[PDB]
Amino acid sequence: SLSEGTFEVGKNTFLLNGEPFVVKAAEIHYPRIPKEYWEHRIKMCKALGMNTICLYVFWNFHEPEEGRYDFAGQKDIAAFCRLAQENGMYVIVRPGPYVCAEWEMGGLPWWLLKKKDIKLREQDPYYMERVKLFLNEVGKQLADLQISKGGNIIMVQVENEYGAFGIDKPYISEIRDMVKQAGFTGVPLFQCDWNSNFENNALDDLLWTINFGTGANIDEQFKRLKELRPDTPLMCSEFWSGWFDHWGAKHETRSAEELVKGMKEMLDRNISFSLYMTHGGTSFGHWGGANFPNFSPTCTSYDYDAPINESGKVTPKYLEVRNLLGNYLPEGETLPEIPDSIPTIAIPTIKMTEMAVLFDNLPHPKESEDIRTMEAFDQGWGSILYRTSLSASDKEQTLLITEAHDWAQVFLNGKKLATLSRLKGEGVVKLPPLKEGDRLDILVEAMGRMNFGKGIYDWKGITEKVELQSDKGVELVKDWQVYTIPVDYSFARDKQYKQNQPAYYRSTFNLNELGDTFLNMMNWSKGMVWVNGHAIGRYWEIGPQQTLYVPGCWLKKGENEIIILDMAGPSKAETEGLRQPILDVQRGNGAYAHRKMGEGHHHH
Template sequence: MKKISLAILMLFCCFQLKAQHTFQLGDSSFLLDGKPFQMISGEIHYLRVPRESWRDRIRMAKAMGLNTIGTYVFWNMHEPEQGHYDFSGNNDVAAFVKIAQEEGMWVILRPSPYACAEWEFGGYPYWLQNKKGLVVRSKEPQYLSAYNNYIKAVGKHLSGQQINHGGNILMVQIENEYGSYSNDKDYLEINRKMFVDAGFDGLLYTCDPANDVANGHLPGLLPAVNGVDDPVKVKQLVRDNHNGKGPFYIAEWYPAWFDSWGEKHHTVPYENYLSRLDRVLAAGISINMYMFHGGTTRGYMNGANYNDESPYQPQISSYDYDAPLDEAGNATPKFLKFREVIAKHLPAGQTLPEVPAKKPVITIPSITFSHSNALFNTLPAAVKSVDPLTFEDLQQAYGYVLYRTTVTGGKQALLKIKDLRDYGLIFINGKRAAILDRRLAQDSTVVTLPAGKVTLEILVENLGRINFGPYLLKNKKGINGEVLLNGQAIHNWQQFKLPYDKQPVVKTGNVNADAPVLKEGSFILTSVGDTYLDMTNWGKGVVWVNGHHLGRYWQVGPQQTLYVPAEWLKTGSNKVTVLEMIKPDANTLQGLDHPILDVVQ
């Protein structure tokens, strides 16, 4: 009996421990354990930060005075192929939330499932586009079914970490800036019900820019506001959509901005934001800085903007964002000045932790490459078709596809690609004849075809699917239409799938002076630290170090370096691989101890 009583007592204690906090909506403020609570939050996306650095970044947030972390959950990373889920390694969002709890930080969770976030397809998995008739952000049955399966998978990992279950997740966001897209309240109610059915039975909220709050808000949920920091306006917007009550939450406050390839690097002086942060905190309004720490959009996960007024604008791999914490996780002057403002509004008796010292940096010695091979020497088996197939047709999410066919030569001709998505290298009998770039609205070029049978090849790169606006469903990649020669469609294609999602092994082979090349080398380190690879003298491509995809580089800038986290380096020999598309002669790679994010060529 004593053993049974002890077991019951332990279970009771565990229940008491897990049920120790409550979080509710008051008329004018959030209530944590029944007392007014002001969220001072900063956005960090766990997928843009190496798992080994999560705790470090969260501690930096705490040192600036934040008490909460906001994060998106990106559907395409957790269900890369339908029915195949991945919540391991850097995808282990539950571990990220748990680390925040261990560090005494609350979390705002944003599983959406649409995120925007300058992320590929706004976070949607590519395979949604293979379902004929599927319409994202709608009541279309195929979409709702796929969405429901995904959000249930997320709920299995995270619903138990809500504050009402003893965890540290204060609130969960449904949809994301939906008012900027549409205004279907029935659809929003379906969202709400799906979240509850998935186990998210705590506080739910919506967030929208000021002009779209009425469209995107679901009655009964808290309407949060994005992009406004005038306390009077924020309070009025919330009250108008929430029965005349608060609390008041700025879900995205932008003290910085992101960059696109070929465009100027964005910086926002901290001086412009100190008084604005001060007045928001003085008014008792909760706030989430987007971004507190951007990190890096590695692999092929950058998104793109596009609308009827502006061209296609793919975003760069660095998500430094001119945020308070830089890409490598170091405090910036903006961090220190924001910290001073936040310190003025701390509860009585509370002090801020010391700011951790800047992390060690190293400069990698100059690297030359021991193995080089033309990309076209390493092709897989071809997929044959009459007309060109898209990435989606080929069941390939990201990376590159080589298209090959044979045409009759002996003439000059206008080559036109209908819907090139997004960057194409044109080869005639193995020699590069042109480059077409969707950013520049280029889809055609005059080519000279020698006499006889001519091999025509088009290497196409997916530069990132559109992540915002009305064109989310016009996101197929590769060649999404016909290829015309003097107005006549070309048929009988071979497609070679080149996803390059893992660091390739490079064997020495012939290198064509015009063709893309794979290069492999190594460098020796006696100690490790954060570092940067200087890609200034290279053309366009991607880099791997020790199995980790660092992201894209492109001579057009503004990003000219790739950040290499210390956690991914080791003493002794380190392996580096480069896929270079347009400058195959480049053969020396320099290290730097600082980033270059502001040079447009």
């Protein structure tokens, strides 16, 4: 076997193979970076002056269906770690089960919600059992990569900021035991929390660390920790810097100044850290999360205004941090060279030739007397259509959908009547006089499940009931035909394309030269996109994001295929490839209630 290296918690310092070592880590999310660019992004982190990469492990990404573990291709976290080792970069693993990170349900799998009374992030028998099985799989993948086994992994995390969730040491203790039983026994295990709550779940046999963002007061952050443990090395597990967007909210950026300063204060005290988002990348497909308690979906782009932008390019911020770090290098040391950027191409207008109307391409219906959530129909992602028939009526009636989780379109005999957005907490629809048998269609699109606090308990579809009010009172609407519309590329491809309402659009285009491009979705309403089978992510006319990053590595010389699922109908069925992204263009009326639009001068 390979020789055994070590990483230890020393006296006021970390020791890498017996020598003091300051962890200068780059936070990276392997699911948000095309597997073909992992190497490139790793090199960018290296030339930046980082010596370590911190990796959250996204549970639902690897086990989208109970029992169906996946660690191949984009999900091959071992491959990423090896790539990291091949570039002399150490790794710190945060194996979940919960990771937050503005990701779908904070990393927890939707199928856990199939158990109505499931209790998350505590010793619920079913939850704990799945956590143990998931961790064991992660162990089979990364345990042999611990530094103690010739690998590059120096530390492993126990849970994630539990202090901001509750107080349950027995739970944390069991999680710790599972991590150890999973195979991670050769390196130190650590906890991370806030200066104001780390004592609530702090275990004595574990390293304690603190998380905070730009503008924090270093001394005020570690003051208490030094008291409890005078000899413990200090580490800001996650230094949050930058800004991630939300649909319907103004785009923002953070100054390189404040960052460089914050990073210098810690460096000047030999305080270890992980720049929370050295490279954000993209929340491809349906993986983006959402804010809690006020539902707010994050944009597809996870640029974060990080040193390394979404497409992996150098930014003024990169240079400023690279130059800063370049000073704290060992005596007689030179920073590695900055890798060349990936070329960008502009693709000429692509006209969607084929079109397939969703209502004319429905899967088999699931029949249900009462309303049930999407998960109750064994679906975790995509859209879900609740259809029924209504009795005749002479006068107008009103429909109250009690919690269309996320975004719904309501149709009467195919004609759109209304659009209800969870961002505004809407739920009422006006019905005109009805004829016996009129068809009521309620198409509910599920966006990301909230990823913070109790937001993880986020059921999609219609959560409780649908009520009809008439001159005779209010009654529940029952007897439903339920159609689950999955996000699988396979489902989007298998449609009756031919040649207002929800539809799949398709077209092929030829390329003679490759490179990264940004699809202009300015002509479209809302939905998701696939290019050569890859799920590029969601888009929404309201912005701030208007383009979708498409990696050149997912493009091919010759014929390329693009499929777009548009929910409300485009202004024009065509898109184009730009060489620059659009992340600061908003459209339409406020997507949120005025008190959250953050602006008031002369409304009305």
